[PDB]
Every structure is written in structure tokens, then in C-alpha cells.
């Protein structure tokens, strides 16, 4: 006999090392991917600036100051001068966790608040 | 099976060899559009703006500003700019629309 | 200048890195600025050829 | 130790390899014997000296004084111990130590400055014990075991630079640096010597300038010499002391050769027969013509063999055989030829070779990058 | 491999056995004159000192000689 | 005063004659060359970092 | 009697938990590492096996053993034996046979069992499954433990050992080729072998077996390989080929193939020393130079020390050749040191170059660089002598006098001077202008560089090749962190 187990048989050991190439180009294609996924995800960065694009063309946001929370979910707010704008709040932050006499960080126009402040 | 396994392998090592030049494709592209999207926030950053002053830094990345006209905004700050620009009493110049910081100025 | 002005910086980095290793502080990458003064020191490189097109005919 | 039984202990070398000045030399050795409890010195030295006859006199004398003033300061020790007190052990402990530098021990001394280096109250005191090992580190010239006291004491003083203590430290700076061939870091040393003193604990201040005049006028350039000491008014001071001295600055910086050959013997003779000094006379030699030399042939492109010869005022027989030499040997200049009989030199150093000066380290980051090519995978 | 060091080892130790302590103490007498002495200065001092050792070693004091003489 | 390099020129015993010249870019061999030597901690330094980590 | 049998159960056993760690751990971390992929994950135990190899070449293991400590010679693997599965009650036995040892003493003994080491590997080695692998770690690390000392009647247990490693595997392989990591393993591994009991082959035999079918298993890798291991047993015939072979038309430059990726990080070096020992009798003046040199300055880990001093005095022995001879300068260790301290009077000689006294300096004193064998360079050297003077006569002036440097020279007669000035012409190495006006020798002897003499066309060549250098340096900064980002 002694082909398929000496002639393909090593033949099939020459396919092993092909293996071994294909370990080559394969571990080339993991390597390289995880760079092309590392340019793909900070292009994308800096592409997610662009959507924080149009909050800077919200010439940013203001200041807001919570001096008294009003039971009707529509906090009044101490604004900059002719301010004092009552208003609710977005609703993925709830009104209780914001303390009154407390400084926030509120949006220019929409009035919805980010976070509490030191 | 074990004959078998050999032209059934070729067809593997086919599929594994046309990632190669389609991930030169994506190498050589993106990087191109990474060039492009570079510029294009750099030239957002253009030298008409207005010149405000940092009063507080809250959170990373994020600040509050106060304004020439003595209102404070908040602002969430620009990534490329390091944390020695987050000093409290600074110089600190946003721009006319886009309010967001390119540098400060040394008093 | 702005590199050897750079490798005074780095020549502080393998302490910093033979200390903790731990947590990255410095938003400064000092690589990538580098690659682009090579990339802008190039073009004496890719002139060099055009000079030699020119001196030819 | 800091007696000045270092200094008359230090006239061995003098004393041992010629024949000649061993008169004198033995002479203030034996009317010194009688101090600073000088028996062990000449008796480890008294190969290198006389016979056994009067030798064997004053040995038994000395010996029984030795262990007289010992257990004085043994019981003055135990009287300082069981008491409140650190000073008083510190300083027990202490002159324990420095009479067992005068009997020339550092066994019992080694351990005894390092009981009271254990009892340093402060890091003054501690550096105070540190010099006390510098000084009979000179006679004994170890080299690593008084750099090593000097090291740890090096960091963290913070006291301040005091002013004979820091100065000492400075001057024993320079101590090493003439033992060792490091002349270019031994250029800052002495600019201390507005505040160098008479030292009998170690060395004269005029022994200090004496020492001071070789490494500043030999390992100095006209530049560092008229930055330095031709404007300091330090050696404007002190070359009143020896009329010599002034010339081999002034006819050595006036280029003079025909004079300064004519009184380089005496540096030669001066230059042996030293403590400290002696086995680099060799390379001082040496050293001062490539640097005369090259002196005279920087500002000269080309040079006949006749103003040459008149200049140095010798043969051209031996001026011949020197360059020769200082092409491969010395390594000054580009080639030297005799076709017409008159030195020519090119020396293109200054355009392409202020580029090609760094081949040299592109070749060794090269190799150092095949090193961390040595680094990948192993 | 470095197991090859081991027999040009041997041969070291038969070198280091050839003088027992003879040439590290004689040898010494001139390591203690150039102990920390930075011995690329050595190489040339030993070269001209060596070149010197022969004939003419210090000459300095013949050359007054050498004035009238030549 | 070539000596002290007040001015350019060197002189000659045998033909007499005066050369004057001079090297105006000083400032790229500097550069170059302690960009060289300040690179050479950089290298060994790392080498150090890797000749710790792997033995 | 209460001195050392006091002291005498407590010293041992402290190299029993380390040796058993490490077994246990290079062992169950091989198999335990590369068992479900053996064929992905590869040479991750290169570097540990040779490092364990090189942490037990300065073993100080056996001093006081062969008396009653002999119970760690017939223990041995014993993992997982019998039955492939159903191992638990093994796992139990692993600490059993280890505690039967340990209740009150064992019946032990040194020579008695050494023949029948291949009771396990005739049914089982470890497990009938990773039988290879387990073989040869089971197998080869133990060889050199009591083939250990060599000497006193152990090289026919060498024997035995070598016919049992050939008859178990490399009589051919149990499978031919296993194109595995133990194929990768078992070239450096065969080849330390044959490195090892070479030794007993030079002791008293020669090249006439082994050594002659391994070219037949040089060969038999299929030439597919990255011939790593392919060199090293390349290197086993090439130091076969150093002490007598001198024909040159199959090695030298036959044996010169492809080049194969040959590192190791230590066989460039040596490899290279080997080379350039069989290169250093053609007398290579450019290349062998630097790249001997360069091989001095390779394998800093382990020592740079106790083995470069062969490349080291070789390198100078050549390096005198050319009128220049760089001593020892920058490295500063006592073995180089000692191993110059005869050779420092006449290199010195070198460069002044006196002929009577110094020919009689070189055989005075000559003891063992002389008894180093055929004084063959030695004798190229006395008459290289007056050629590396008339070398530092060429760094010197130009004309040729018949009084001063014919006598200086100690060469007396108008013919010798221009005639041997002119075998100096003859090389090539010099710049010299052959004139007769009045019977003088002229010479223009311009050794200016090419500072403003055609420097674009001059350092052309090395900014090619510099920049190709530092480039290919710039594709090893590319090519190992993709070695990085490979396994995430």
C-alpha cells in the first residue's frame, strides 16, 4: 500500500503545513483587522464629534440653578438675568434626585438638565 | 473524508486569501477618510471667535465657562486638548458659534 | 526642535514606565505628531527624485 | 589619618623606588616615629627601610604606650557607656577610631568607625566619618571602598554646602579625580579654590595649586584657559609663589617651545617621584606635545621643517619620527608628506566630517537596533 | 547549545591552573596602578608606554642634550 | 588671533599664503548629532525594560 | 559521625521540590499548553525548554547522590498510564508512589536499572494518545541526568542511551515527519543529543555514522522547512568539519543553500564563528572582519564572556593581519583578559615589528598558541611582519631612503626596498606613484577621503544600504506587533 499513509500521507503533511500558511495569512487577517477595527471605531470617533457638531452650533449650553423644585414636575430654575425659566426637565433624570439650591448643568433652549454640579 | 479533506481544505485557503487584498482595501481607504475626517474638524476650528474665561472643571472632558458678558455656559470640551488647559483661572477662548475651545491665551 | 524638544520629554518616559505601567494619564501620545514631521521630512525625499527628473531632461 | 603623619606616611613612594632621596626621606621618617604612634607604619614599611639594631629599641616603648592610651580610651569608653548620652559615645568611639588611624589599623578602626557610623546623630557627623575613611583611604589608595562612603553620603544632604566640610568633600573630588585619569569632570573641582584653605588634615592649599596646575594646564584649551584662570585672579594671586609656574603658562600660552622644552625637565623630574601623581607621568608627557602640538598645527596649514625645527629647537631627526607617530599613535591630523621636505596637512574636518561624525554612532544604533532585532521573539 | 563552553571551560580551568594565583597577584601589582582607570587610556598609555618600555622612555631629559648635539 | 578664531584664515611657513573661508550651517550636525545621543537612552532604556522583562 | 549525619537528611531535600516543579511544571504545562491545539499555538516552549536547559547546565545536582539517594532514578513520568481514560485513580496514584517513598526508607541503587527504560514505551509511554510529545518529555530531559559524568564506564551507557533514543524515535520517528511542535521540538532536541553524546563520538570515534546519515535526516525534512533545526544539525557537521576536513568543494560554498531563517538568537552567532573560523584561513580581510566581530558581539545573555573569547582571539589573531590590531578595550572581564596574557607581548610586537628579536620572542615563551597547532597563521605572520610594518611605513612618508628606512626597515640593498615596497604596490591597499628621476622612489601617498571628492557617488551606497537597513528595521517594527495584535 504505503501511498496514503507515505505518499498522500505526506502530502497531507505538506496540506498541514499549508495549515500553517493559512495560520499565517489567518492570523495576518486577525492582526490586521483589529487595526482596521481600531481606525474603523476612532474615524467613527471623531465622526461622533461631528454629531457633537451640532451642540457646539447650540453655541453650548447654560447654567441652570434650581433654588425651589416645584411639585407639578416643572421645576422653576434661577436663570441668568431675565431668566427664572420653569420648565420640565428630561425625562431620563427624574425631578427628586435634582436637590433644590443646587447648581445643574441646563441646555440654552430645550431647558433639560444634564447632572447636578459642585 | 481524509482525501477528501484536502480539495474541501483549498476552498478554506481560497476564502482566506481574498481578505488579503480586501483588507489592503480597507487599509488603504479608511485612513484616507480618517485624513478627511481630521481636516474636516480642523477646519471647523477657524481663528473669528469670541474669548470667554474657565471658571470650574465639574467632570472630565466637560466644564462650565463663564462668559464675557458674565453669563456662565456649559460646555463639553474638545477631546484633542489635554488637562493643562483645565486650569481654573485661564485664558480660556472658544469660538464665536461653535463655542467649544481651540486654545488659550497666555496672560 | 520639536523633536529633540519631544525626546527631552521621553527621556523621562522609561522611569515613568519602569515604575507603573499601570493606567494611561497623559492625553500626550508624542508618536503620531512625529510620524508627520517624517511625513513632512519626506518630501525632501520625493523632491530629490524631481530635482534628478529635471537635472536629467 | 588627618595627623600629619598622612603627609610624612605619604613620603614612602619618594622614599622607596629611588636610592637617592631615601636620606631625607628616612630621616623625617625616623624623627617622626616618635609620633602619632608611628610603629606599625614602619614596621609594615621596615623592608623598605633600615636594619633591626636601633629598630628594636623603640618598638617596646611605643608597643606598651599603644595599649596604655588603648585601654584609656577602653575605660573612658566603658565610663562613656551605661550613661545617657550620644556625643560622648560618639566621640569615645570616635577618638578610639582615629587613634587606631594613628597606629595605621582599619580593623579595628573599620569596625570602629562603623560603631560610631552607627551612632551618627546627624548626616554631618556621619560625613565627618566618612572623610575620617577618605583620609587614611589616601594613604591606603583603595579605590572602592572610599567611593562607596562618598556615594551614600553623596545623596541626601540637604544641609547645605558648608564651608571647609562640602569644600573638603570638593577637594577629596578632587583627590580622586588625580588619581583617576578623568580630567575634563576634574576641570570643575577646583573652582572651589577661592575657598580652599590650608587643609593639614589632608593637603596644603599651595600643594592644592601645585596639584591644580597640571590638570588646568595640560587638560585645558586657550579658551578654558583665558575663560578660566587667565581671567581668574586666583593664580594672579599665587604665581608670586614660584617664578616657574608663571612660565609654563605664559611661554606655553605664548607658544614658546625653544624655553618650555628647555624647563619641561623639571616638570619631568617634578612629575615623577609623586604620591598621588606618578604612574599617568607617562600619559602627561605625552598628552602636553599632542597638545602642543596640535596647538602649533591648528592655526598652521602647511609648515616648513625649518621653522619647525627652530621653533621646538631640536633635530628633525626627532620631529620626524614624532608626527609619524601622530598620524597612526596620536591620531591629529590627516597624512603628512615629504615629498618637498615640509609639513602639509589638509585637515577637510570641518565640512563633511562635522556630518561624518556621526556615521560612527548610525553604525552603532544600527548594531544596537540589530540587538533589538536580537530582542524579537526570544 | 553553551554546552560546548563547557569543554573551552576546561581549558580554562587548565589556563587557571597552568599559575595558580601567580599572575592575578603579579598582574595585580599592575591592576592596583590601573584599577578604575578607564583601560581604553590604558591601551594607549600600554602602547606608547610598552613602544617606550624598551628605549627612550622618559628622553624628555636628553632632548636638552639633543639641543647643541643636534 | 586665528588661535583665539577672531576671523577667518590660516597661514603657511613654507609658500606664505593666506586662506579665508568659512562653515555657515553649524546648526544641522548639532541637531542631528544630540538627536542621536539623546536617542541612545531611549534605546538602551528600552533595552533595559525588555532585558528586565524577559531574563 | 553526628556531623554530617546530623546535616545529612536536610541539605537533599531541597533540590527534590524543584526538580518535581519543574517537570511537573514544563511537563503539565507542554501537554496542558498544546493539548487541544498543538498545531495552533507553536514554539511557546522553545524559549522555555532551551531556558530550562541552559537554567540546568550549571546545576551543581549530584555531588553526594550516589550514596542512598538513588530512589529518583527508577522513578520516573508515570502519568496516566495503563488506560487512556478513567485516569482518577491515577491521579490518586500520582501521590501514592510519591508517599510509598516517603513512610520510612526505599531499596535503591544507581547502575543496576538502566536497560529496561523501555518497558512503558514498548504499550504506553504516558497515555497511548499524545505519545510523541510524552515520549520525548518523558524520555529526553532524563538522558543527560544519568548519562551525566560522562566518564568512568557511562559512555557505553551512553551507547545504550543512544540506541534507545534512536530505537524509540529517531531510528527514523514513529511517524516519519509528526509536523507538529515535537517535529519543531525534536529537530533541536535530536540535535542536542547528537551535540550531546558527541562528545563519547570524538572521545574515542570519529565522523563514520550518525553523522553520515545526518545528512540523509538533514534532508529528510522535505526542505519545506524553515530549517532552523536543519542548522543546528548543519552546525554539528560544520565543528565535524573544523578539527580535519580542508576540502572545500562541497561545504564551503556547496553547502551554502537559500539561507534559511536561522536565529535562535544564539546560532547566528555561533554558526557564524564557525563559518568564519573555516573563512579565517583564506585569510578574509573585509568580511570576516566585521561580521566575525559582529558574531563576538551576538549571544550577550547568557555570558559574553566565558565562549567569545575564541571568537575574540581568533578575531585579533586576523585582525593583526592587516597592520592594525585593536586590543582589548571596551570589555573588561578577567577571561579575555587571561586568555591574552600570553598573547599581549607579541601583539604589541606586531606594530614595531622588529624581525630577529621578535621571532625569537614568539618561539621563547610560545607554549600553547604555538601548541595550538601547525603554527600556521603564526607563520604566515613572520613574514607578514615586515609587510605590516612597511604598512605603518606607507601611514608614514612618502620617499624611500637607502640609509634611514631601508635600515629602519633592517632591509639593506637598493633592489629589496623598491622591490618589496613594490609587493606592497603590487596589493592594491596603498596609493603610491612608482617614479624614477634620479633613482628615488617617489610616492604621492594621498590618502584623502572623499570630503569633496565625489562624495554623491560615494556614500550613494551607503545611504542605499543604510536605508534599506534601518527599513527592514522599520518592517521588524511592523511584522512583531502584528505578532501582538494576532491573538486579540
Given amino acids: 500500500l504505503e501511498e496514503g499513509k507515505a505518499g498522500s500521507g505526506l502530502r497531507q503533511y505538506y496540506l498541514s503545513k499549508i495549515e500553517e500558511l493559512q495560520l499565517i495569512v489567518n492570523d495576518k487577517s486577525q492582526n490586521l483587522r483589529r487595526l482596521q477595527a481600531q481606525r474603523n471605531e476612532l474615524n467613527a470617533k471623531v465622526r461622533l464629534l461631528r454629531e457633537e457638531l451640532q451642540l457646539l452650533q447650540e453655541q453650548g449650553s447654560y447654567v441652570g440653578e434650581v433654588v425651589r423644585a416645584m411639585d407639578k414636575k416643572k421645576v422653576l430654575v434661577k436663570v441668568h438675568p431675565e431668566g427664572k425659566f420653569v420648565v420640565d426637565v428630561d425625562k431620563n433624570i427624574d425631578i427628586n434626585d435634582v436637590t433644590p439650591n443646587c447648581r445643574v448643568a441646563l441646555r440654552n433652549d430645550s431647558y433639560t438638565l444634564h447632572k447636578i454640579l459642585p | 473524508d481524509l482525501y477528501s479533506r484536502y480539495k474541501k481544505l483549498q476552498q478554506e485557503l481560497e476564502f482566506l486569501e481574498v481578505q488579503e487584498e480586501y483588507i489592503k482595501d480597507e487599509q488603504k481607504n479608511l485612513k484616507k477618510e480618517f485624513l478627511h475626517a481630521q481636516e474636516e474638524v480642523k477646519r471647523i476650528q477657524s481663528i473669528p471667535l469670541v474669548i470667554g474665561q474657565f471658571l470650574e472643571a465639574v467632570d472630565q472632558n466637560t466644564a462650565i465657562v463663564g462668559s464675557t458678558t458674565g453669563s456662565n455656559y456649559y460646555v463639553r470640551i474638545l477631546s484633542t486638548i489635554d488637562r493643562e488647559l483645565l486650569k481654573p483661572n485661564a485664558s480660556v477662548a472658544l469660538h464665536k458659534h461653535s463655542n467649544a475651545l481651540v486654545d488659550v491665551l497666555p496672560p | ?52 527628473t529635471v537635472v536629467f531632461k | 589619618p588627618k595627623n600629619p603623619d598622612l603627609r610624612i606616611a605619604q613620603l614612602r613612594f619618594l622614599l622607596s623606588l629611588p636610592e637617592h632621596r631615601g636620606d631625607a626621606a628616612v630621616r623625617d621618617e625616623l624623627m617622626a616615629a616618635v609620633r602619632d604612634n608611628n610603629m606599625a607604619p614602619y614596621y609594615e614599611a621596615l623592608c623598605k627601610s633600615l636594619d633591626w639594631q636601633i629598630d628594636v ?170 575663560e578660566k584662570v587667565i581671567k581668574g585672579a586666583e593664580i594672579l594671586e599665587v604665581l608670586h609663589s614660584l617664578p616657574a609656574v608663571r612660565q609654563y603658562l605664559f611661554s606655553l600660552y605664548e607658544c614658546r617651545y625653544s624655553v618650555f622644552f628647555q624647563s619641561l625637565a623639571v616638570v619631568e623630574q617634578e612629575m615623577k617621584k609623586d604620591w598621588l601623581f606618578a604612574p599617568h607621568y607617562r600619559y602627561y608627557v605625552r598628552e602636553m606635545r599632542i597638545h602642543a602640538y596640535s596647538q602649533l598645527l591648528e592655526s598652521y596649514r602647511s609648515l616648513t621643517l625649518g621653522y619647525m625645527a627652530e621653533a621646538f629647537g631640536v633635530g628633525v631627526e626627532f620631529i620626524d619620527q614624532e608626527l609619524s607617530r601622530f598620524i597612526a599613535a596620536g591620531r591629529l591630523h590627516c597624512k603628512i608628506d615629504k615629498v618637498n621636505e615640509i609639513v602639509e596637512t589638509n585637515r577637510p574636518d570641518s565640512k563633511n566630517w562635522q556630518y561624518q561624525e556621526t556615521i560612527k554612532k548610525g553604525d552603532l544604533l544600527l548594531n544596537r537596533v540589530q540587538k533589538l532585532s536580537r530582542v524579537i521573539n526570544m | 547549545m553553551s554546552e560546548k563552553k563547557q569543554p573551552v571551560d576546561l581549558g580554562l580551568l587548565e589556563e587557571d591552573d597552568e599559575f595558580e594565583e601567580f599572575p592575578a597577584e603579579d598582574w595585580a601589582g599592575l591592576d592596583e596602578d590601573e584599577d578604575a582607570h578607564v583601560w581604553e587610556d590604558n591601551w594607549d598609555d600600554d602602547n606608547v608606554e610598552d613602544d617606550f618600555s624598551n628605549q627612550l622612555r622618559a628622553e624628555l631629559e636628553k632632548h636638552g642634550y639633543k639641543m647643541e648635539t643636534s | 588671533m586665528i588661535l583665539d578664531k577672531k576671523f577667518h584664515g590660516i597661514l603657511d611657513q613654507g609658500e606664505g599664503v593666506l586662506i579665508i573661508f568659512d562653515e555657515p550651517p553649524v546648526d544641522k550636525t548639532y541637531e542631528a548629532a544630540l538627536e542621536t545621543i539623546q536617542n541612545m537612552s531611549k534605546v538602551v532604556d528600552s533595552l533595559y525594560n525588555k532585558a528586565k522583562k524577559l531574563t | 559521625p553526628p556531623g554530617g549525619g546530623e546535616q545529612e537528611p536536610p541539605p537533599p531535600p531541597a533540590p527534590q521540590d524543584v526538580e518535581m516543579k519543574e517537570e511537573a511544571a514544563t511537563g503539565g504545562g507542554s501537554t496542558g499548553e498544546a493539548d487541544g491545539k498543538t498545531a495552533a499555538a507553536a514554539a511557546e516552549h522553545s524559549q522555555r525548554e532551551l531556558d530550562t536547559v541552559t537554567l540546568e547546565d550549571i546545576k551543581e545536582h549530584v555531588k553526594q547522590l550516589e550514596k542512598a539517594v538513588s530512589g529518583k532514578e527508577p522513578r520516573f513520568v508515570l502519568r496516566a498510564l495503563r488506560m487512556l481514560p478513567s485516569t482518577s485513580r491515577r491521579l490518586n496514584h500520582y501521590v501514592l508512589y510519591k508517599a510509598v517513598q516517603g513512610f520510612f526508607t526505599s531499596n535503591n541503587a544507581t547502575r543496576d536499572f538502566l536497560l529496561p527504560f523501555l518497558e512503558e514505551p514498548m504499550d504506553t509511554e504516558a497515555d497511548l494518545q499524545f505519545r510523541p510529545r510524552t515520549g520525548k518529555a518523558a524520555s529526553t530531559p532524563l538522558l543527560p541526568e544519568v548519562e551525566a559524568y560522562l566518564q568512568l564506564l557511562v559512555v557505553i551507557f551512553m551507547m545504550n542511551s543512544k540506541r534507545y533514543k534512536e530505537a524509540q524515535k529517531i531510528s527514523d520517528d514513529l511517524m516519519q515527519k509528526i509536523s507538529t511542535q515535537n517535529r519543531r521540538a525534536l529537530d533541536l532536541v535530536a540535535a542536542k543529543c547528537y551535540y550531546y553524546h558527541a562528545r563519547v563520538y570524538e572521545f574515542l570515534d570519529k565522523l563514520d555514522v550518525v553523522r553520515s546519515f545526518l545528512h540523509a535526516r538533514l534532508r529528510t525534512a522535505t526542505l519545506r522547512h524553515d530549517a532552523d533545526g536543519q542548522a543546528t544539525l548543519l552546525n554539528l557537521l560544520l565543528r565535524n568539519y573544523l578539527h580535519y576536513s580542508l576540502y572545500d568543494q562541497a561545504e564551503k560554498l556547496v553547502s551554502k543553500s537559500v539561507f534559511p531563517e536561522q536565529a535562535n538568537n544564539n546560532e547566528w552567532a555561533r554558526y557564524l564563528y564557525y563559518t568564519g573560523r573555516i573563512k579565517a584561513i583564506q585569510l578574509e580581510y573585509s568580511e570576516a572582519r566585521r561580521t566575525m566581530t559582529n558574531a563576538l558581539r551576538k549571544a550577550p545573555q547568557h555570558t559574553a564572556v566565558g565562549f567569545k573569547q575564541t571568537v575574540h582571539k581568533l578575531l585579533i589573531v586576523v585582525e593583526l593581519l592587516l597592520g592594525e590590531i585593536p586590543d582589548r578595550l571596551q570589555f573588561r572581564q578577567p577571561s579575555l583578559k587571561r586568555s591574552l596574557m600570553p598573547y599581549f607581548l607579541l601583539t604589541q610586537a606586531v606594530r614595531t615589528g622588529n624581525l630577529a628579536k621578535f621571532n625569537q620572542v614568539l618561539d621563547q615563551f610560545g607554549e600553547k598558541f604555538q601548541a595550538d597547532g601547525t603554527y600556521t597563521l603564526i607563520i604566515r605572520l613572520r613574514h607578514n611582519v615586515i609587510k605590516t610594518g612597511v604598512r605603518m611605513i606607507s601611514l608614514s612618508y612618502s620617499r624611500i631612503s637607502l640609509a634611514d628606512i631601508a635600515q629602519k626597515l633592517q632591509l639593506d640593498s637598493p633592489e629589496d626596498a623598491e622591490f618589496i615596497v613594490a609587493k606592497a604596490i603590487r596589493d592594491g591597499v596603498i596609493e603610491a606613484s612608482i617614479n624614477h628621476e634620479k633613482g628615488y622612489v617617489q610616492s604621492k601617498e594621498m590618502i584623502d577621503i572623499y570630503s569633496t571628492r565625489e562624495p554623491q557617488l560615494a556614500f550613494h551606497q551607503r545611504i542605499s544600504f543604510c536605508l534599506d537597513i534601518h527599513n527592514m528595521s522599520v518592517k521588524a517594527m511592523r511584522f512583531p506587533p502584528k505578532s501582538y495584535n494576532k491573538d486579540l
Wanted: glycine share 4%; with cysteine.
Fill in chain 4, 57 to 226: 629599641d623603640l618598638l617596646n616603648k611605643m608597643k606598651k604606650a599603644n595599649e596604655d592610651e588603648l585601654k584609656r580610651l577602653d575605660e573612658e569608653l566603658e565610663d562613656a557607656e551605661k550613661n545617657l548620652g550620644e556625643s560622648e559615645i560618639r566621640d569615645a568611639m570616635m577618638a578610639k577610631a582615629e587613634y587606631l588611624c594613628r597606629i595605621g589599623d582599619k580593623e579595628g578602626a573599620l569596625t570602629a568607625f562603623r560603631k560610631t557610623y552607627d551612632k551618627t546623630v546627624a548626616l554631618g557627623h556621619r560625613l565627618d566619618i566618612v572623610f575620617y575613611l577618605l583620609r587614611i583611604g589616601l594613604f591606603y589608595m583603595d579605590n572602592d571602598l572610599i567611593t562607596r562612603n562618598t556615594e551614600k553620603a553623596k545623596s541626601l544632604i540637604e544641609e547645605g554646602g558648608d564651608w571647609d566640610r562640602r569644600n573638603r568633600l570638593k577637594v577629596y573630588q578632587g583627590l580622586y579625580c588625580v588619581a583617576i585619569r578623568d580630567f575634563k569632570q576634574a576641570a570643575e573641582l577646583f573652582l572651589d579654590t577661592v575657598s580652599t584653605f590650608t587643609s593639614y588634615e589632608l593637603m596644603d592649599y599651595k600643594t592644592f595649586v601645585t596639584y591644580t596646575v597640571y590638570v588646568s594646564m595640560i587638560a585645558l584649551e586657550r579658551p578654558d584657559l583665558r
Fill in chain 3, 1 to 52: 526642535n520639536y523633536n529633540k524638544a519631544v525626546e527631552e520629554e521621553d527621556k523621562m518616559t522609561p522611569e515613568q514606565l519602569a515604575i507603573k505601567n499601570v493606567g494611561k494619564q497623559d492625553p500626550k501620545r508624542h508618536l503620531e505628531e512625529h510620524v508627520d514631521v517624517l511625513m513632512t521630512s519626506n518630501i525632501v525625499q520625493c523632491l530629490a527624485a524631481m530635482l534628478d
